[PDB]
Design a binder for this molecule. Sequence first.
Ligand SMILES: CCCCCCCC/C=C/CCCCCCCC(=O)O
Ligand SMILES: CCCCCCCC/C=C\CCCCCCCC(=O)O
Lengths: 186, 183
Amino acid sequence: ANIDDLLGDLGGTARAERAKLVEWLLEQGITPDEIRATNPPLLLATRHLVGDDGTYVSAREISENYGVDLELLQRVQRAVGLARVDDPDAVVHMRADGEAAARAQRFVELGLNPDQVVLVVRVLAEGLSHAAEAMRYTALEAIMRPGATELDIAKGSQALVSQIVPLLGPMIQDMLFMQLRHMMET
Amino acid sequence: NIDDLLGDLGGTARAERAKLVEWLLEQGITPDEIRATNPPLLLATRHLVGDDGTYVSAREISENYGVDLELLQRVQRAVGLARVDDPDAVVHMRADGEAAARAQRFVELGLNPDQVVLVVRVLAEGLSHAAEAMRYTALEAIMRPGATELDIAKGSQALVSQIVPLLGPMIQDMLFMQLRHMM
Ligand SMILES: CCCCCCCC/C=C/CCCCCCCC(=O)O
Ligand SMILES: CCCCCCCC/C=C\CCCCCCCC(=O)O
């Protein structure tokens, strides 16, 4: 009944299904802490498919790991809207997020204006967050089938999201180059 | 002779266009390509973003990539970049047609086609704003004191060549970052 503190204030059917979901999440190496911190837990087991392995890093680690400037790194993280956690020593950044933010540096190395570069991140992040919303709803519609236990959905999202992820990177990339092409001809 | 590529241009403007056309022809660009494109400036740069000059119809895309024509045309509308909604009109850049053809695979995995088409629409709109912020960013880096057409063309080709390899990986990383923070 360690699990009991993870079901929270839930009752009846919803508590028994959540208990099945929690048992399974624990076998997938999700810790009680990740489950308590994530409400609802349903898609904790799909997260590793989009690059969250549960490992964290500080801004200092990021800046030495990926060879980038800490000030610039901080500005980018703000633009993306992630971890306002201003302190550059707190180990509170998803590892994939630090890699992604460090790419900023190379555009500045080529002589692009640091301010314009942070701007582009800001604008891209705004657009993509809306697109991520609709994506989630889209995939939710697909997995959620009447008489679906919470565990049925979690397992079904693993199978579905697993198949979709390899297509998404190429898709968004094509969609960016489509805009660039038509901004050049335009 | 170039003269008809130069047209009504006179003065400094003709003299500069002559040097740009000169360099474009040795870059392997045809007089044909230069006429249709005004100004001809980004012609030796647009290949870097996947515009090779090839054009296709929605029907050819449909047949060549084995995707549903009707779904394909909804996706093209959702991107919102070419005005002809005629299956046989040859007005889609080849790379745009392939990109539109990817959408059906999401549908064969159980995603609802109305939701997919809407996602395309929302993505297209987010990316067009970024793309304009990118254009201004690129120009600032390229445009220098009293630059000629040709300096601009050379500067843009060098700069885009260096940036493009980075851009794909970057936008893809940004999408996944948003997907990690979905709650
Ligand atoms: C031409 C573009 C077509 C658009 C296709 C639509 C894309 C489908 C969206 C992706 C669904 C996967 C979302 C996964 C979210 C995982 C959330 C989590 O980390 O727990
Ligand atoms: C903080 C890191 C963000 C990095 C964002 C990358 C900045 C991209 C800016 C330049 C890429 C744009 C290339 C195409 C622009 C138009 C060029 C042209 O047609 O003249």
